[PDB]
From a paper:
Lipoteichoic acid (LTA) is an important cell wall component required for proper cell growth in many Gram-positive bacteria. The LTA primase LtaPLm initiates LTA synthesis by transferring the first glycerolphosphate (GroP) subunit onto the glycolipid anchor and the LTA synthase LtaSLm extends the polymer by the repeated addition of GroP subunits to the tip of the growing chain. Regardless of whether LTA synthase or primase, LtaS-type enzymes, have the same overall architecture. They are composed of an N-terminal domain with five transmembrane helices, which is followed by an extracellular C-terminal domain (eLtaS) containing the catalytic site (recently reviewed in Ref. 12). Although the enzymes share the same fold, substantial differences in the cavity of the catalytic site and surface charge distribution contribute to enzyme specialization.
The lipoteichoic acid primase LtaPLm transfers the initial GroP subunits to the glycolipid anchor but is unable to extend the chain further. To identify differences between LTA synthase and primase enzymes, the soluble extracellular enzymatic domains eLtaPLm and eLtaSLm were overexpressed and purified from E. coli and their crystal structures were determined at 1.75- and 3.0-Å resolution, respectively. Although both enzymes were monomers in solution, as assessed by size exclusion chromatography, eLtaPLm crystallized with two molecules in the asymmetric unit and eLtaSLm with five molecules in the asymmetric unit. A structure/sequence comparison of the two enzymes highlighted two sequence insertions in LtaP that form two extended loops (residues 544–552, loop 1; residues 561–570, loop 2), which interact with the long helix α18. The insertion loop 2 in eLtaPLm forms a negatively charged protrusion, which is repositioned through Phe-566 on α18 by ∼2 Å compared with eLtaSLm. This also leads to the formation of a surface groove, which extends to the catalytic site. The specific loop 1 and loop 2 sequence insertions are conserved within primase homologues suggesting that the resulting surface features are specific for the function of primase enzymes. In this study, we found that Thr-307 in eLtaSLm is phosphorylated, whereas the corresponding residue Thr-279 in eLtaPLm is unmodified. Specifically, our work revealed that LtaPLm has a smaller active site cavity, lacks a second GroP binding site, and that two conserved loop insertions results in subtle alterations to surface cavities. Based on our functional data, which showed that residues Ser-486 and His-488 are required for LTA production, we suggest that the absence of these residues is an important factor contributing to the inability of the LtaP enzyme to produce a PGP polymer.
Numbering used by the authors:
A (entry chain A): 203 to 610
B (entry chain B): 202 to 610
Write the structure that this text describes.
Amino acid sequence: ITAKNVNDIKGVSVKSNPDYFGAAKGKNLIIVQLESFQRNLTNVKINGQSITPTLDGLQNETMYSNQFFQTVSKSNTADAEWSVYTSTFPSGYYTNTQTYGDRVIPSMPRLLGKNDYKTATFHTNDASFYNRDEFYPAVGFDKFYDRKFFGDEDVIGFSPSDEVLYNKAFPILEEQYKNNQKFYAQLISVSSHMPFDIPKDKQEIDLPSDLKDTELGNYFEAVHYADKQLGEFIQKLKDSGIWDDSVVVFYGDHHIIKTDQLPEEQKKYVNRSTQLKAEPADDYRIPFFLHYPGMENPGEIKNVGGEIDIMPTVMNLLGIKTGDQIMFGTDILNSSNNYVPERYTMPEGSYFTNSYMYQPDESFETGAATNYDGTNKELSSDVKKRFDASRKLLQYSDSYVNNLPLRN
Amino acid sequence: DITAKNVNDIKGVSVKSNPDYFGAAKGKNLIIVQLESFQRNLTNVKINGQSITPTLDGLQNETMYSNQFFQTVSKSNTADAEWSVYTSTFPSGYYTNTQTYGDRVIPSMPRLLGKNDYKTATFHTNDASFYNRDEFYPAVGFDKFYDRKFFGDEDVIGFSPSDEVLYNKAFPILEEQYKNNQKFYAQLISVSSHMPFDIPKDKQEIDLPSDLKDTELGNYFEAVHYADKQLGEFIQKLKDSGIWDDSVVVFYGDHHIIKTDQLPEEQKKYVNRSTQLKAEPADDYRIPFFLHYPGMENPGEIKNVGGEIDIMPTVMNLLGIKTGDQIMFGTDILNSSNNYVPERYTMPEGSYFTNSYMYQPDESFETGAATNYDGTNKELSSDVKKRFDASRKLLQYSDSYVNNLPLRN
Ligand SMILES: [Cl-]
Ligand SMILES: [Cl-]
Ligand SMILES: [Cl-]
Ligand SMILES: [Mg+2]
Ligand SMILES: [Mg+2]
């Protein structure tokens, strides 16, 4: 298995002389993974109250996507991290951070570490969760900051709040910045994790009575809190000068609300402005925002992507050659026909494109392609090719990951 | 390979082989009322001499009742309560079970009663599309459900007809079954005390002190008082008609709604401390539970703990119905003394409540904490470990069992 072979199997055409290559050469990298944020519940107003004003404001000054998809399996948050760090698929069976925490895993932090970046990840819960204390070394992060680093002050749910996350991380980044140390920081938010129970004094949305004592109402309070704290973190990055010297990426780890299951009177709260009339496609959309210094071309990215695509997309902006490193993702700024294979909650060979989703049943022929306007799509040759490629890619990714060398 | 015996062995609660009260209510009707957002630490409260729940307080002298009965809910609280009660299986840590498994043939209390000559119905004044009830109720084998279409749009409180309309329109249906010798199980789901607790001004009967007036807790007290009043009127009709003397009647709160430790300091004096558990969330997770059956000679406080999953096995014993090979994760609370209640979703998996302490894990079992209900720490002994392991295994088995249920089509 080689990098070329994998790319040929996927069959997505990527520019040989890529645009934006090294547009952010030598810049820092800050990535924030936002817990349980989904695109169809962002940019929503409840009686004039914006739920995600921070994300809404970023649309004018970033490249962002309305068709960016989660690529997760059994352990959703950890599968998101797996996808992003490794550009390999999460398992259909295992939790990869558990099963492969004993391997030497090629990765984004490892590659950046070979290009003079110090690398760290930040999360306020204990790193024993999902085997993170083994996984983070396995992917070659120089450091991870876990509950031991963050206090037990201002707990929301089961660990310190996003406010504590950003306030304790920022000074570390500021000191690296002042000392001319190129850095990659990954922050994993948590305050908007289910059950979305936010202290009363931190709830800022006055909910209408059809949202009171509902999962969706609680979700909106938690997302609003998380978005607020993100905005305060961004303002500190701007004031400090870090923003103008860094690539910054924000994405939701995965969806949490099944919007077609909502009570009928709550459905009016779902954002329909970029709705896909196919499930689970619509819900599987996660917000995605990308900033880099001196960007001249902000706006909507048309090519679809998933979490596995973040690494190749970012490495291109940072001007880093990936060489022989196997990546199952694609640089989304240098392709136009990308697609995203899915598994676990969907059968193997399921995938999303920029215009339709395919899902098999007992066989390819008994499956269904559904256009994003809701109409059926005939199972043509191209639909078949992506199904076959998707299944082969998953096989290769599973085999590749399973054959990684042991750390000991 | 999951059997009823295996599940019971995993839980490890000792249940009398020759049970007491078996068939004490053989052949009687069953009426169960699920009271929206009632919690035990906000019942039997007086505000300046005014009783908030005088109906429930009065029942204490003539029922078996519990001061340590717990909610067992997850993502969709009201529906998870119904799930727990009808199925005696745990709500999911991930799904809303009434949504995800509404396409299954689900073994249940109404299904089992239907095989013992009961006609079964559930009543709720909102639209049955909510939480997939219009599929869930058939899935568990209710003969009928009566929803908003049946109740009309008179006397709306909040978003649907009042508890008064619920009881007034249900009663004549029960009365006709009674007169025609049709044994029945009726499940009524109240709604007037749902948040935001908006009760019409002419229906507010508590004169609130200024530290409660126009506050969430104040509105909560008016709504609970209204709901308790209407429950009392329903009971009086059951008594007058003769149905009361021919029926097992169970009342329970679906789940708590007020986080009492988050109240303003001056409102905390309103919380009932008389049977306080000095552990959270144990204290708030207590829901009222009252059981009546005709010719009961032994009214008073049930010492053994229970949760919503325990209602089915407890009731089937009273009705003299053998459950056979039907898998139940709950326990007959009148024939055990060491029952415990696993919790999830708002607590980590392996958390549980006993009659004397709560356990909650952290990163591992060993880094968790057992807290006695007097507030003191409890050392993590072998028995504490066994219940943690059993709790986690029970949740796994329940999730697997429910996921493997056959499709209705
Ligand atoms: Cl008790
Ligand atoms: Cl559930
Ligand atoms: Cl139990
Ligand atoms: Mg997550
Ligand atoms: Mg409820």
